[PDB]
Symmetry: none
Subunit: 124 residues, 4 copies
């Protein structure tokens, strides 16, 4: 199935938009959490979302920065979903998971994209 994860530091942030995007992109359930993306230890809801998703499911977020603002922890999460065979989609990067007969590059794209964004998120 399709699980989404939404995070905002404050309520003044457009949380409705985020939830609508996740829904629009097929979110069945959305684990919503009001917390900073600096660390995962203080984000039990994320731990629930990651534990709930299972082989075959889809885990969606609007952006990497929503998943976290910690390069190390973010990359750790991206590999967790791979190993668990859960597909990570980013609604702002809808075609990132699309196939183009070059498994090498495609995989290499994600690795680059995700690592760039995971860093950016942390530096900000």
């Amino acid at each position: 199935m399709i699980i989404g994860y939404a995070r905002v530091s404050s309520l003044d942030q457009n949380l409705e938009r985020q939830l609508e995007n996740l829904k629009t992109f097929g979110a069945e359930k959305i684990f919503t959490e009001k917390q900073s993306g600096k660390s995962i230890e203080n984000r039990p809801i994320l731990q629930k979302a990651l534990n709930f998703v299972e082989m075959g499911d889809r885990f969606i977020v609007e952006s990497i920065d929503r998943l976290g603002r910690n390069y190390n922890e973010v990359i750790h999460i991206v590999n967790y979903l791979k190993d668990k065979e859960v597909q990570l989609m980013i609604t702002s990067l809808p075609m990132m998971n699309e196939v183009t007969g070059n498994p090498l590059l495609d995989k290499f794209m994600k690795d680059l994209i995700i690592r760039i964004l995971a860093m950016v998120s942390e530096q900000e």
Copy 2:
């Protein structure tokens, strides 16, 4: 329209495939030439003067277009200024990898520049 470009420095290369891959994606014309520089490649210059706004310049791979990081970037810049959409047959969909127009441009620049440094050091 759609325009292609092919190159083979020597006498022993599968030039037929190169011409057939361009035709596959819809190459209407092909400026075939027989990549260390552009000064000694007029067939390329002709292919660049032909293409105008709205057209699509295509190669099989960036190494065909040239084996010089400096020159290969200068030409991709040329095609852009001229509003000619560059496409690689071996790397289709390079335009929109994610959907975000911001990263699409960035990656396009990135992959091209990877391919260019490879084309040179080889």
Copy 3:
């Protein structure tokens, strides 16, 4: 010689640090200005006309130089054509990351272009 550049669009920013970080690395002069475009930034233009071959144009970060992917790349191109070594105080050693002159150039282009797309979308 060594030349710096600083910018602050508004009235509430730690402009002192920005001027002190440039001085730290050896900024002899600083063209301070008060980044959505360059047409409305002459102090930058003056900093670019001053720098000549052999000089070193420095900023604190690429976002200072401008918040436009298109324009930020055009200026780094300008500095290169003019043989002016661009350096970022917050990212020193960006020049030689590995030692291989081939990757150094590639990465330089890469990090800059990452920083540029960030400076814009922010």
Copy 4:
């Protein structure tokens, strides 16, 4: 200590140069192997080198392509040495492991560099 690994498909390749570079860069022992970099399963010498190196040691190669021509297997090896706390150096990229007060980027550099090169090696 400093262990090096040298590989060549054929003897017509300048193996002496490779060995001299490894030595010059401090190679104490050099596991030399005459084999393709397409796979590791058919490279028992590499398996010996990787098993021999231990926490604190250094594992050096002239280039990534020497380590392999398989993006997946290469990345698998780079993480193996990390987890084992063995420092991977590339004599053609001597300053790649150098420190520059930006642990974020530095790590992000390697991830990019290594992933670029690992791909290039495979595609060639």
